[PDB]
């Protein structure tokens, strides 16, 4: 057991898009939740299924650090049940979800004059993303009956859209970096723990 890489998932440089939501499997290390709850610098920081206080006395099989960027006004959907354009076609959290949602404002990084179109999101998907499902299909959404087979026009829509992150946008339209932590409960050896190193 060692210390986990939270200084990389959070203190990162480039972030993925919501439809292509990143993920980093964490195992073989005893974490350090101090920098996370004592942070006080995030905007949205809630845990569903466990109190951040009683985490250092807990151990886990694996920890999943899903990280992506969405406009702040949409962080409300990164939570169980909560729906919308992000929880339906981009990233859906299960009802029995047991983890934490951590997000912070980042327009000082992901907002370039004229629009930092590096971040995208999904507009159409015939299927609502099943809990943790991924829809990175670039297939032209066939709006109408006549197929598309290529470039768009009517009845043909490029399923992805962009984010015009400008440093002057509204407090809600600004980009926010999210981190969704998942916790694994398996009857197998546990390689993740909090300051509970007395059990190895």
């Amino acid at each position: 057991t060692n210390l986990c890489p939270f200084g990389e998932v959070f203190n990162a440089t480039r972030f993925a898009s919501v439809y292509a939501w990143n993920r980093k499997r964490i195992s073989n290390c005893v974490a350090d939740y101090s920098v996370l709850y004592n942070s006080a610098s995030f905007s949205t920081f809630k845990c569903y299924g466990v109190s951040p206080t009683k985490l250092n006395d807990l151990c886990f099989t694996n920890v999943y650090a899903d990280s992506f960027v969405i406009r702040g006004d949409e962080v409300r959907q990164i939570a169980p049940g909560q729906t919308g354009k992000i929880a339906d076609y981009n990233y859906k959290l299960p009802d029995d979800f047991t983890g934490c949602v951590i997000a912070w404002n980042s327009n000082n990084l992901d907002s370039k004059v004229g629009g930092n179109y590096n971040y995208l999101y999904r507009l159409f998907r015939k299927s609502n993303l099943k809990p943790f499902e991924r829809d990175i299909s670039t297939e032209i959404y066939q709006a109408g009956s006549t197929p598309c087979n290529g470039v768009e026009g009517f009845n043909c829509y490029f399923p992805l859209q962009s984010y015009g992150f400008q440093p002057t946008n509204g407090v809600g339209y600004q980009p926010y970096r999210v981190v969704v932590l998942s916790f694994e409960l398996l009857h197998a050896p546990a390689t993740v723990c909090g300051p509970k190193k007395s059990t190895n």
Partner: antibody, heavy 119, light 112 residues
Framework: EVQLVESGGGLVQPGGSLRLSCAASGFTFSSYWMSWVRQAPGKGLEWVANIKQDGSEKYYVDSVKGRFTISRDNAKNSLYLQMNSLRAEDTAVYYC????????????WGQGTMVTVSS | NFMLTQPHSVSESPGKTVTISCTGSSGSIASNYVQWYQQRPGSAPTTVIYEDNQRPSGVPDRFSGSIDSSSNSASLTISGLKTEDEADYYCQSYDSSNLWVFGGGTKLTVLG
């Protein structure tokens, strides 16, 4: 078992100094965020200051910024609040409260000491 | 400029159930945990609900915390009311811009 006792309150006319102090007893003091929450008589509760569990970073309401100095002492299980250049608005009952982490949970509340500011 | 708004007084009979609302002004509840502190007259506050819906050790089942996903507001519901529950209920939370904010308080009166 956990208890918090505050002393040092009283009466002072506008502009004078005063120093509140809280006596912690019952928990691993070196593991909680200490905050001062004041409540004017007949009014609601209003947070005032919050010092980190290791004395690193302190926070205050903009009302008292530049005049109130929160300060803790882990070894002596104590928390202080130097109230220099007091105003009449500051008249309230000050309580010392325990946090644990940043987001919410003002766990326990001492009985608090009264601070009256009237010339 | 993130305030917490709360009604002044709510009154209900002994056995019935009452609900106290806590709406969020410029800002957004449900983005952070919500607490509910009970303050009987002349006494220091006690925590009845912490982390939007958890009752501490010793708080009766009568107290329940809910965090509305629609109207941007959390609500405290004291079911099967007791005369001892008459008190002042304040709701608190945290925001990145404005720090720990409290509600205006509600005087829950158990009609006698």
């Amino acid at each position: 078992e956990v208890q918090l006792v505050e002393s040092g309150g009283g009466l002072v006319q506008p502009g004078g100094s005063l120093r509140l102090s809280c006596a912690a007893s019952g928990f691993t003091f070196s593991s909680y965020w200490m905050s001062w929450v004041r409540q004017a008589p007949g009014k609601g509760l209003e947070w005032v200051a919050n010092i980190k569990q290791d004395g690193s970073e302190k926070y205050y309401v903009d009302s008292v910024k530049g005049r109130f100095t929160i300060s803790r002492d882990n070894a002596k299980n104590s928390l202080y609040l130097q109230m220099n250049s007091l105003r009449a608005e500051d008249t309230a009952v000050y309580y010392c409260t325990r946090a644990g982490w940043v987001r919410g949970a003002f766990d326990i509340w001492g009985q608090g000491t009264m601070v009256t500011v009237s010339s | 400029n993130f305030m917490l708004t709360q009604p002044h007084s709510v009154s209900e009979s002994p056995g019935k159930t009452v609900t106290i609302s806590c709406t969020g002004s410029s800002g957004s509840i449900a983005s952070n945990y919500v607490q509910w502190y009970q303050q009987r007259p002349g006494s220091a506050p006690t925590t009845v609900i912490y982390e939007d819906n958890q009752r501490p050790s010793g708080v009766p089942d009568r107290f329940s915390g809910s965090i509305d996903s629609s109207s941007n507001s959390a609500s405290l519901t004291i079911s099967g009311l007791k005369t001892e529950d008459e008190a002042d209920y304040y709701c608190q939370s945290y925001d990145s811009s404005n720090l720990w904010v409290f509600g205006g308080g509600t005087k829950l009166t158990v009609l006698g």
